[PDB]
Symmetry: C6
Subunit: 189 residues, 6 copies
């Protein structure tokens, strides 16, 4: 029965933050966790197999599918979630060893928030830069291994585009929210 | 042995509600949880593969299956369950931080109930708006990529239509029940 | 170390029942749980794929397999188990909130037992009504989408028919047992 | 920290048995549990798909595979393990409620041991009766739906026959051991 | 909070052994556990499907693959690990009941070590006897069901042969180590 | 409630190390753990099936895919992670038995760090030696079983090459960090 120590760990790690905002921050974050855990994994379960093209030349389908999608979608969001969760883990380990060492901080928090914002905005910007957020069923290709160009048909364009709509919205509110955190810190400081 | 604190958390979070109704509320909610966890996931496990059409033109089958089902079914109910569970998580985190802060409310509950009702009724209304709740084995299509129209055959129409019958009924009783909650609050207030 | 409270919860929830019978009631119930968890799920893992018919017309195989089996078997027993487990969950939550409220019943139990019996007997009766409990490898069909009739061959008729033999027997003993409970209550009352 | 109560539960449930033998009884039983959990499940993972016959008539392969194997192997051993574990669960629940009721036996144990022996010997006898314990790669068939007879080839005859050798040996030692238990009881009594 | 009892269980069960050696014994054993849990299972996941031969006669491929590999590889190592873990389980249960009975040994340990060594050396010897530890991509066959002989190609010979190199080395160091245990016991005794 | 003992275990095992560095050491290590657990396993889930070559001669595709990739990628990194985690397990077991034995060190730590560095640098060097870190979609082959040479097309070259970019960077920072540990020890000593 020593859950008081971890409760006080949480109290200290989240003491110097906004009164209301961390609530829905954690809520939306676990909202990601659950959706990414179930929905998108089920959605791109057989995506690679589902993709095919009307040509019969061996190799062209693969290279065109590679060019038309250099990055798999689930891959980008899981990297995003993990990499944005990294600073949280860093700071919690930091405070862990802190309370351990005075058993015998603010500017770190600022830096953590700032890099979180930078990583999120950079991932969003590069996603927009490569392919934006809109997508057609039929795709053209331009590759040496096969002549001219092959129209290739996507598996489930509508469902995944609606998904990226939700994900863009939640990314936007996350950006709003960490800007709010930065403003609160800047106003107190 | 500090389960008394969480018991009193539950006592406080559910103190200002109906005497009888939360019982079968939680029962039907976990009833969803279990059915969605096992049954529908097993049901639409190979739905995309199961769908096929009598034509042989590459691309038409995919676009027609997309148009005839812009949204996968499991997808709609999992989004529903998660999104309706969101306000519960919000309010429990809220009261968590509350008891934490007076360790050193009603109108929120009203708002939570109201938005829960709004989300549920909106999801039901849009589901009816798109395709209602009745479904045939043979489906027509109307798309540019392939000529005329292709009859396409559904995998297991009867089992899933019976499933949506149960799900419509449980949605209706859920609506009944949160209207009852609203009436109880409105009569006390 | 507060397992005494839950022990006394179980004591109170099962106090007004038969001396001997709940033992093998719970035993047979978990017996279901385990068998349904492993055996039947493994048995109907690839049933839909395994089914095929000697005709080549697209659509007829699917509609004939739908008509010949409007309900998948695992589906009926999992719905049965869940739906019969519902009243147990209801009553345990009920007594939970009870002991919680006098921290500051018999006729409910009768009603729970009665509806359990009604649901079990109704599920058994409708299963018999649709297809009984006997089954052949070769099945006829009668549907508009394809001419005349197609003999269709079942995947593993013998193993699943032996399974439904066991399941019918266990359903019968369950019926015996809740009738015994009802008789005990009726004799005490 | 109330593991003393369950320790004393185990002490009482196993008090009136052999000094040495229950040790390797439980060891061999969990030995089953692990082997059945991993090995045989991996072994018959794709058995149904692996089976095929040199004929091309639709239906004959299925009915011949059904006749040549009316029961799947994993199915028989999982039913065996579960059904032999049933009396153990019965008796442990029995003693549970016992110590609960004098909180306010030997002949049962004899009956449990006897039925365990009967079930084990009956399962072994019926397995021998149907197909014994020896098995060839090539199998003949005799069924109306297809003419004459089709040689059908088994997937992995050697590995599974070696497995049934181990399983027969462990069944034999289990029989030895419960006969030893019966002899000890008969000599004390 | 009664982990002291299990700590003292471990103290007693491992008291009469080598000072340094059990450390890396347990380390290498869990090293097996993890590698076998992930790597080899992923490696032979689709081995049976991957194997094929250039002939088209039904049955010959299966019987030749059976003869060329009478035992699947994962199967041999999982049997090895389980069967070598058996004496450990026996002895721990033994000492369990011991401390339980004086709550109201060395020669057993010697026997356990000796049989562990015997089982390990016997498994290694029989593995060498059947096919040694070296393996070619192309394999000949000699079976009645198909004429002459068929060259058959292995799926991933290099990766699995490197794996058996590691496994042979770890088996050798395990043999070294239990011989060291035997020498320590023989020198003390 | 005896988590103080394990806390003091961690305190002692990590007492003689760098003040800041172990934090992000553990962070990046679990970062591996998670990425390897989800991403790469999903990435090479169907790699072997995805690979194919434009020739039709049985056997050549397999041997060419073997030569062009003697080692599967996931296989190398999982062996890396496990084998580098081995010294950590060794040293923690060592200190476990230590505190156990004075219940009735530095140079070991140096050796552990040194071998960790050696294993990491050796794995990186051999990976570079075999195939470096750059990779093309089209691969040539040179094998006796099939004439001349076959161009073979890789499944997803871009995504996995970007992955190995991240993995090379994290390996480099790991090398930096254990060199920092070695420098700190060398300067204190």
């Amino acid at each position: 029965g020593d859950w008081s120590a971890l409760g006080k760990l949480l109290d200290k790690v989240q003491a110097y933050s906004t009164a209301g905002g961390k609530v829905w921050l954690s809520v939306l974050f676990i909202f990601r966790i659950l959706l990414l855990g179930t929905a998108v994994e089920s959605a791109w379960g057989d995506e690679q197999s589902a993709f095919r093209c009307n040509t019969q030349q061996p190799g062209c389908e693969n290279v065109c599918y590679d060019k038309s999608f250099p990055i798999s979608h689930v891959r980008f969001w899981v990297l995003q979630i993990i990499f944005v969760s990294v600073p949280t883990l860093l700071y919690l380990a930091h405070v862990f060893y802190v309370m351990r060492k005075e058993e015998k901080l603010l500017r770190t928090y600022i830096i953590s928030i700032l890099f979180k914002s930078i990583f999120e905005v950079a991932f969003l910007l590069i996603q927009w830069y490569i392919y934006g957020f809109s997508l057609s069923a039929v795709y053209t290709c331009k590759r040496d291994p096969c002549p001219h160009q092959v129209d290739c048909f996507l598996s489930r364009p509508t469902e995944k585009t609606i998904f990226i709509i939700f994900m863009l919205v939640v990314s936007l509110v996350s950006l709003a929210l960490n800007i709010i955190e930065l403003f609160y810190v800047f106003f107190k400081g």
